[PDB]
Amino acid sequence: QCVNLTTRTQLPPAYTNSFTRGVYYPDKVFRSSVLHSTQDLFLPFFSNVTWFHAIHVTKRFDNPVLPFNDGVYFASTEKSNIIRGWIFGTTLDSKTQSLLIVNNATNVVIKVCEFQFCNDPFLGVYYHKNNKSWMESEFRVYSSANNCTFEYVSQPFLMDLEGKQGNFKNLREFVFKNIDGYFKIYSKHTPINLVRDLPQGFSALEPLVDLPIGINITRFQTLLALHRSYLTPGDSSSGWTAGAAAYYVGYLQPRTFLLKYNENGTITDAVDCALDPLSE
Amino acid sequence: TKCTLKSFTVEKGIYQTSNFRVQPTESIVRFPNITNLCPFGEVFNATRFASVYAWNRKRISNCVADYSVLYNSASFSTFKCYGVSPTKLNDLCFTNVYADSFVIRGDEVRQIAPGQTGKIADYNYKLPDDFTGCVIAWNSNNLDSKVGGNYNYLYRLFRKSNLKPFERDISTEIYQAGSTPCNGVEGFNCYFPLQSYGFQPTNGVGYQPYRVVVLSFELLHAPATVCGPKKSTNLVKNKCVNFNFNGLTGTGVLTESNKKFLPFQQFGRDIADTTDAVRDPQTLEILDITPCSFGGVSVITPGTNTSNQVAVLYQDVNCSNVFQTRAGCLIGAEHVNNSYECDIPIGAGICASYQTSQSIIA
Amino acid sequence: GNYNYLYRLFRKSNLKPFERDISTEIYQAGSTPCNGVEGFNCYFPLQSYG
């Protein structure tokens, strides 16, 4: 296929537990001071998820292809915006319409096209020593793009492209759902402050976009970025620095909750209707 | 009361007949708040179009279509829509709007139809048999016909087979008909497919070049994003009118609210799981719905043999001898300061009787 | 060719049951109103058969 990266000591995955995550509103209507029960694609309380590491500062770079099931909950713990974008598709061999959602430092590019992806897709920036500037140099995503159905180009902006090290200080929350082909993305940012694992807490979720595709998505993959600097030996085939970040992926399954609404009509407390007979 | 009881002698008591409802007066319809417009200014009016064998395909997506912006800056000659009425292009939405722009002669316009024969419809641009779209043709003797002579427009004369619908064929090779293969000698059985037209300003109106743009779309297929125009109304409040808010049909009094919502969802329901409030989708204002269908009517009689006059009890009505009780609004009976024994029960400690020149007192 | 039989194709409104329509008017399709000269966007309501 294409070129790949070497000296990749892939650790075995570890299974951890999440604590009351994935509680979003039923529909487009507000209700107040009233208890109402629905059936949507949720995470059950106290479930087991899979933890994938991306810390190198060691020698860990793993980004496998995950199959797209009936709702994927995505919480991301970042400190320097390591996770750039996502790709969606079935086979990724320029014969199936592929969705590519990338958050570049200049534009937000969303393209539903027929792309050709390689074996190991990633991103790469270069940091100079004589000048303090972050420029995108290595862009090893695709070879060619011929056919397209959709293109979404946003406004130009500026990002710092941080590459510092330390503890996690962002919590990015993405909720991917499909009802009748409508791709429903839900966004939430939380300024967390802890070292590792997953923090505990309770919060509601806000909408982002409802992009109306009509394709069948089977698999997806999350692309990372590499820092090329003075710590590299001097080659792009073996010298890399992924950074230090962690992302949590959980698959949604249709539960039933009871939601408590205050005077402002937001989610305050959720009761799982089948976890134990007291909550039942 | 007689047609309620189905009798001719009505005994003393309170009876129920019907209900007082208030009819709506106006009907306001919202929806357009999005200022996006499809680029019609280059489709029907360009600097130079293309030939019939090499027509230009333009994709129209992520905008709002309109019909009234077509007859204010351009005059046409031929306008025919196949498979759809031209007056149904406003309420109905569209999917996959494609425009095929090509320039032909004035005698070839009738050959561009879904189900004709000839040369152009079989060798240049094949139309489908179940075609659903509009065909727009107009005269343009301004840019397509040079005063010194324009011969840049070409058409295909010789081809091996026919064409599929929505197929473009561009070839500049020498056509071969029989034996002695040519590869360019310009001899016997060596045909050139791309032949020149005869667009001259010295001829008649039939030899003038005509610009034909065919709009093709789909109906009731795929998640659409480009719909047609929509008429909008004004906003009226504190009146029981009919309305339509984001597809929800409601009729009632839209009073001002004292609560605020969150800026991503639209409607509002109360403790009873029914609609109590709605956000205005144009002015972003929370409006409380309350319909004007409240109350019933009740008839008080002293008896048929006693008198032929009544008192009328309006149940949930705020208010000759109009008196408001705690049980409702009473018309046809006067309130007295004296307290008698109760004869006909009404509600909330009010009773009516027939005392003293005599009337019904409450 | 037998072109002696006609039918109504364009009409502004619909019809009630048990009613025959005799008089025909020049139908207007969108803008450019006709007012009885039948110019642009003025289709005829009566069309022949095949």
Numbering used by the authors:
A (entry chain C): 14 to 70, 76 to 298
B (entry chain B): 299 to 617, 640 to 676, 689 to 694
C (entry chain A): 447 to 496
Provide the authors' own sentences about this structure as they appear in the paper.
The spike glycoprotein is the most prominent surface‐exposed entity of severe acute respiratory syndrome coronavirus 2 (SARS‐CoV‐2) and possesses the vital molecular machinery required for recognition and fusion with host membranes. The spike protein mutations that cause increased virulence and immune evasion are predominantly found in the receptor‐binding domain (RBD), which is specifically responsible for host recognition via interaction with human angiotensin‐converting enzyme 2 (ACE2).
Finally, analysis of the spike/Sb#68 complex dataset revealed two distinct populations. The most abundant class showed an 1up/2down conformation without sybody bound, which is identical to the one obtained for the spike protein alone. Cryo‐EM map of S‐6P, with an 1up/2down RBD conformation. Structural comparisons revealed that Sb#68 cannot access its epitope in the context of the 1up/2down conformation, due to steric clashes with the neighboring RBD. Sb#68 cannot bind to up‐RBD if the neighboring RBD exhibits a down conformation due to steric clashing. Without sybodies, the spike protein predominantly assumes an equilibrium between the 3down and the 1up2down conformation.
